[PDB]
Amino acid sequence: KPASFMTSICDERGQELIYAGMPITEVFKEEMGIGGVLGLLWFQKRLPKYSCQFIEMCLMVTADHGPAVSGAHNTIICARAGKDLVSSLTSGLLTIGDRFGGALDAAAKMFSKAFDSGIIPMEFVNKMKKEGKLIMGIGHRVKSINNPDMRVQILKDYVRQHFPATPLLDYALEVEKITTSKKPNLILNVDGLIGVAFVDMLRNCGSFTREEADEYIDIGALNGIFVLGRSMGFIGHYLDQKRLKQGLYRHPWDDISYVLP
Amino acid sequence: SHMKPASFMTSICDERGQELIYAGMPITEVFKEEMGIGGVLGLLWFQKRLPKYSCQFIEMCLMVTADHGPAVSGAHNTIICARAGKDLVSSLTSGLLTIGDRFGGALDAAAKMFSKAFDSGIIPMEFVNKMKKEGKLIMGIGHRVKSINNPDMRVQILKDYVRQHFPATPLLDYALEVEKITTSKKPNLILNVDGLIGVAFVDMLRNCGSFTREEADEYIDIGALNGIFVLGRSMGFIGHYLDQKRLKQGLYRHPWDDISYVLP
Amino acid sequence: HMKPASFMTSICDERGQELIYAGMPITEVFKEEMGIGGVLGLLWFQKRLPKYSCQFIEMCLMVTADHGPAVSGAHNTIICARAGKDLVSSLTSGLLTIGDRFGGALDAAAKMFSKAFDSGIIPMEFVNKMKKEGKLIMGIGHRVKSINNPDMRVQILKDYVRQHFPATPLLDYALEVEKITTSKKPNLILNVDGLIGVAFVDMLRNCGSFTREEADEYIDIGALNGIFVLGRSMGFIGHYLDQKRLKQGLYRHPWDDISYVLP
Amino acid sequence: PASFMTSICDERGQELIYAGMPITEVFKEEMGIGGVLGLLWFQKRLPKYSCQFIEMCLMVTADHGPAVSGAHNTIICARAGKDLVSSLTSGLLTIGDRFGGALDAAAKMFSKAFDSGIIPMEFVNKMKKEGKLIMGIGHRVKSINNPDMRVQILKDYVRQHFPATPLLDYALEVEKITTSKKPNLILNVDGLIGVAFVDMLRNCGSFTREEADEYIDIGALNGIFVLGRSMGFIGHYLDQKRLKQGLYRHPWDDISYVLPE
Ligand SMILES: CC(C)(COP(=O)(O)OP(=O)(O)OC[C@H]1O[C@@H](n2cnc3c(N)ncnc32)[C@H](O)[C@@H]1OP(=O)(O)O)[C@@H](O)C(=O)NCCC(=O)NCCSC(=O)C[C@@](O)(CC(=O)O)C(=O)O
Ligand SMILES: CC(C)(COP(=O)(O)OP(=O)(O)OC[C@H]1O[C@@H](n2cnc3c(N)ncnc32)[C@H](O)[C@@H]1OP(=O)(O)O)[C@@H](O)C(=O)NCCC(=O)NCCSC(=O)C[C@@](O)(CC(=O)O)C(=O)O
Numbered sequence A: 001k002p003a004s005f006m007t008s009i010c011d012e013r014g015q016e017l018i019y020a021g022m023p024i025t026e027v028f029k030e031e032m033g034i035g036g037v038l039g040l041l042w043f044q045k046r047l048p049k050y051s052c053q054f055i056e057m058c059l060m061v062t063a064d065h066g067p068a069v070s071g072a073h074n075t076i077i078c079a080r081a082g083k084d085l086v087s088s089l090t091s092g093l094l095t096i097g098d099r100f101g102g103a104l105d106a107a108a109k110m111f112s113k114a115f116d117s118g119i120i121p122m123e124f125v126n127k128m129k130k131e132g133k134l135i136m137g138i139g140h141r142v143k144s145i146n147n148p149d150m151r152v153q154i155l156k157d158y159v160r161q162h163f164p165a166t167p168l169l170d171y172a173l174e175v176e177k178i179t180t181s182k183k184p185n186l187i188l189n190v191d192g193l194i195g196v197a198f199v200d201m202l203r204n205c206g207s208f209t210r211e212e213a214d215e216y217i218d219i220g221a222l223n224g225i226f227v228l229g230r231s232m233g234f235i236g237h238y239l240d241q242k243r244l245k246q247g248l249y250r251h252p253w254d255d256i257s258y259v260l261p
Numbered sequence B: 001s002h003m004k005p006a007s008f009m010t011s012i013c014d015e016r017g018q019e020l021i022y023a024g025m026p027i028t029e030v031f032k033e034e035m036g037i038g039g040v041l042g043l044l045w046f047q048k049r050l051p052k053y054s055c056q057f058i059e060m061c062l063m064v065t066a067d068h069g070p071a072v073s074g075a076h077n078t079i080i081c082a083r084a085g086k087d088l089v090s091s092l093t094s095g096l097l098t099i100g101d102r103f104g105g106a107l108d109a110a111a112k113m114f115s116k117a118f119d120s121g122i123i124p125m126e127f128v129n130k131m132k133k134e135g136k137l138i139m140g141i142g143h144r145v146k147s148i149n150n151p152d153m154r155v156q157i158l159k160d161y162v163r164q165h166f167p168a169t170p171l172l173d174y175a176l177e178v179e180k181i182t183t184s185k186k187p188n189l190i191l192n193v194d195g196l197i198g199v200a201f202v203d204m205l206r207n208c209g210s211f212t213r214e215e216a217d218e219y220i221d222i223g224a225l226n227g228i229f230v231l232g233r234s235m236g237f238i239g240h241y242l243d244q245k246r247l248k249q250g251l252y253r254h255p256w257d258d259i260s261y262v263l264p
Numbered sequence C: 001h002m003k004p005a006s007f008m009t010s011i012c013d014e015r016g017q018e019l020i021y022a023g024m025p026i027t028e029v030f031k032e033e034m035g036i037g038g039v040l041g042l043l044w045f046q047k048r049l050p051k052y053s054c055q056f057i058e059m060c061l062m063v064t065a066d067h068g069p070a071v072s073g074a075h076n077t078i079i080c081a082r083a084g085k086d087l088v089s090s091l092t093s094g095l096l097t098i099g100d101r102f103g104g105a106l107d108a109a110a111k112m113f114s115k116a117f118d119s120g121i122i123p124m125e126f127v128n129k130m131k132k133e134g135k136l137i138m139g140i141g142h143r144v145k146s147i148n149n150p151d152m153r154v155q156i157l158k159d160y161v162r163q164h165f166p167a168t169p170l171l172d173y174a175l176e177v178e179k180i181t182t183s184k185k186p187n188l189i190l191n192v193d194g195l196i197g198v199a200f201v202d203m204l205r206n207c208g209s210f211t212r213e214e215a216d217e218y219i220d221i222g223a224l225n226g227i228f229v230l231g232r233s234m235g236f237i238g239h240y241l242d243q244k245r246l247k248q249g250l251y252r253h254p255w256d257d258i259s260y261v262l263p
Numbered sequence D: 001p002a003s004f005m006t007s008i009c010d011e012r013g014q015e016l017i018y019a020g021m022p023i024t025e026v027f028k029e030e031m032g033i034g035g036v037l038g039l040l041w042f043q044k045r046l047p048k049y050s051c052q053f054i055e056m057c058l059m060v061t062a063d064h065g066p067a068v069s070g071a072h073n074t075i076i077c078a079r080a081g082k083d084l085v086s087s088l089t090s091g092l093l094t095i096g097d098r099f100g101g102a103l104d105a106a107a108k109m110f111s112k113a114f115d116s117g118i119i120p121m122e123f124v125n126k127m128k129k130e131g132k133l134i135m136g137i138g139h140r141v142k143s144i145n146n147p148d149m150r151v152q153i154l155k156d157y158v159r160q161h162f163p164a165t166p167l168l169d170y171a172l173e174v175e176k177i178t179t180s181k182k183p184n185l186i187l188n189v190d191g192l193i194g195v196a197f198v199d200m201l202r203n204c205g206s207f208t209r210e211e212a213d214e215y216i217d218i219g220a221l222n223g224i225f226v227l228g229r230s231m232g233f234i235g236h237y238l239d240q241k242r243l244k245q246g247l248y249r250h251p252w253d254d255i256s257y258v259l260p261e
């Protein structure tokens, strides 16, 4: 009778629930917060307090960015179609991972690879252009070296105050000085910031070996950060459409080009 | 060492043996007997070998519900998800999850509501007035763009087939009388495709001979009818996904000028 | 001409210099140390809530974060991850199990207990009447926790509410119901759905940011189920990552656990 | 400029149109479900035998029992009291890689070998040398003298009705080599459907090679499996409701908990 399931993160078979070896009462006695629970359940580690707080700040900063982005819009459409909360949320979450919400992960990987390989920022920039590859985590539809992004400033201020070192973030900022020298909209965007700061946390907070940090980036920890954070906003938009008593939506024919054979 | 009772029960398909079985029909007999997709649905959903005209009706329903353009909630969401770079299954399901009481999934409720009124003995006008006195939408009635001035050819095709092939259509007849009343008052309160398929399946299940009344009522109650639209329209949503990938449409973001922001 | 807008929105404005959550700029959200609980108060309830309320919301997300791999949603997420799928697919395969039976009884519990309380029915008459009809008490019952196997999640929440909330009439009523139901069936405890449900009603009704009608509306539109959905999303993502790190392979349910009864 | 563009269906007129054919003409021409799929997925009026082939694939893939990942997940949702769409979707979301992905995988692998100009014996050897299993080959029980009847049925139709089947021919030569090594290593139903579908696209007359390859690459065969198996998943949903099955919780005896200390 060899067990068909295997699990590492939570044991609810005893009288008191356990998260990664910490009884739930100790989680609260130690004031771990949501960020510390995430460290237990996603990484099976008791993270330092500043790392737990940084995780919570990432969830707060990614909670929403308005009703116009793909996933919020799809949730809103479901809500207006009279659907339940979970269906509507899911409809929006399913838009995430590539062009919407995927740049956190892509930036963490692309910057880590350049940094680890020893290529300097100017040569990384020149390489990616000669190769016609966009630098993930760089560029924004509206923000600029003159209209800075406040979410970037907030997270940047915090990690510099608490992290032992932020080498990948510093490298990414050297890239930004070069890219914005040319095009002022090629800033380090909020997705690139979270991505590189999260690598710096995993690599420098002391709870991970390099191999462990590399594995958690590879299996999608950062995808999870964006998904969990933005779920709060999408549920908010679901509730908002119901509070505003919004009826069924159908897209107007004027905004659609039909090109049949 | 002791025998553990099985935790799951299943009735529709057996893959354990020398050949696949659908509701007791071996797959070789399914094809020998020319059961087609409609007959396989009869086996897997209704546990019966249905008459040929019923199998053909099921296929007609899947064909007429296959798509209704990119503007409807589910197609719009599938398109947005494809344009966000997502895979076929994620994009399809993002659209399917819009299907419900307002878009696409009123077949269950329409069958139940019309059956109740019909079986209760109230006449069509009394049904319309009662729903109005309560605060209740007539499910299977109404459309955002189709109307008495813009008729739905899907409904016509289905009606035509049912009248030629079904042995009895009392609920469809009742529903058309209702539609006569609702469209006099408001021109887009037509019998929509959900309502037509809903009442036509009630007529089929009650009168085709393969079901007892108890069985027919149970299939309405557990939600079989909505599956017809879900399975049908899945072909269109997959089409939209493929279309958007071929067209290489980029990431969508809704325009701010179409949104009224009213924060506290 | 002025074409009217087709969408309305009230919770977040990203158009300006600085992101705004429900009228609070993101800089002030962090200066005021609102935390995740305060952001939820802003985005879901459109209010700046007191700190003890924000901390209670965070506690609810922490205590609902996971309850093992055996429950319906974690099971489905694990199986989807073992099928090689991506994080979002695997998470949502499990979230879609949340409803009346597993995880999503908070809406119904809050509505049913609020209705009983507001009507003046005493706990025993509430129990007998649901018993005399065929209606489950939402927020009562558990497959494995019981009077002999208590839920520490419930204990932690009750302790916090008792220390910080200004009033707890619905919780007190629900605990009276639990005494009655567990007298005859040891598994009919007040579960985490019912506890969070009734505690949230007590919070919304008495925190001072809502009229009774406004609080009742949030129950009616289904806000409280979101608390479990968002909370448990953290555990389901954890299960996905766990299965990927464990290199667990494709799952297929054993035939010996399935009774086939075809026509 | 219009924000949406679409090619497959026009519902703006009085009469609905599928890819240039009015719906009344779809029925007058007895296009069937296969012909509708040709219009909506490919914007082509496919030959009759191609349309019938498509319907046979949907029938053959409709279900394969309650134990596979997606059917199981749908069953769990149904036992949790959820609605049809939620329960169906929970199961569909398991599809694409280790479950339900072999039609696509086999189409691609065989097409790549064939287009390499490499002969079957060299393909088998290249794959052994690269450590790769051959997609669409192998079955747990059936054998060169105990055949899979789904393969027999579809193979017979294809060989009787397709004018040319070069990729199937190629795959049958691979199978003769692999069944010499192990009588178990048959072309399975996913391999058959995969290569036959490629043959249909490449040889039915309606597509250029570029178009055929594009439809494979963007997931047309994933679509065939999803649409086909959706019929069975809906069946399982209804079955669980009919059988009045209550909430499931997996037994602790079948679970190995390995938390940190
Ligand atoms: C973001 C954008 C599409 C913008 O493009 P743009 O449209 O302005 O410019 P393009 O027309 O593509 O090109 C202009 C010229 O600059 C060159 N150029 C552009 N980007 C370049 C680059 N990265 N590396 C090198 N060169 C570049 C290009 O090659 C051309 O050069 P050339 O013609 O040769 O002169 C683009 O940067 C991009 O893909 N970034 C990488 C992916 C990424 O990080 N995504 C996340 C962005 S944060 C986000 O998504 C969150 C959100 O925004 C969500 C919301 O609210 O919606 C929020 O706030 O939450
Ligand atoms: C479908 C729609 C939202 C349309 O409404 P409309 O928006 O135009 O009207 P509203 O502005 O909402 O209401 C104006 C006044 O009429 C009243 N009124 C409306 N419907 C009424 C009714 N049924 N019974 C009584 N009264 C009614 C209402 O109470 C209000 O009265 P009041 O406030 O008191 O002054 C609405 O009928 C509805 O929910 N139907 C029931 C659900 C149903 O059967 N859905 C399936 C149809 S689609 C489908 O399945 C697929 C599709 O065909 C879709 C596509 O192609 O688009 C495809 O193939 O994709």
Ligand SMILES: CC(C)(COP(=O)(O)OP(=O)(O)OC[C@H]1O[C@@H](n2cnc3c(N)ncnc32)[C@H](O)[C@@H]1OP(=O)(O)O)[C@@H](O)C(=O)NCCC(=O)NCCSC(=O)C[C@@](O)(CC(=O)O)C(=O)O
Pocket (backbone or CB within 6 Å): C066, C067, C071, C100, C101, C102, C103, C104, C105, C135, C136, C137, C138, C139, C140, C141, C142, C143, C144, C185, C187, C188, C191, C192, C193, C194, D246, D247, D249
């Ligand atoms: C939860 C369960 C299905 C368990 O039932 P059981 O299966 O053990 O009992 P059954 O065999 O169904 O019934 C035996 C006899 O008791 C009667 N009886 C049962 N419940 C009764 C009741 N509420 N009111 C009156 N009577 C009742 C029934 O009428 C029958 O009477 P009779 O046949 O006439 O002799 C059931 O209570 C139930 O639906 N509750 C309401 C929904 C609810 O609140 N769900 C949330 C709880 S989980 C959650 O949200 C998260 C979770 O904690 C999950 C985890 O950890 O697992 C986590 O964190 O993951």
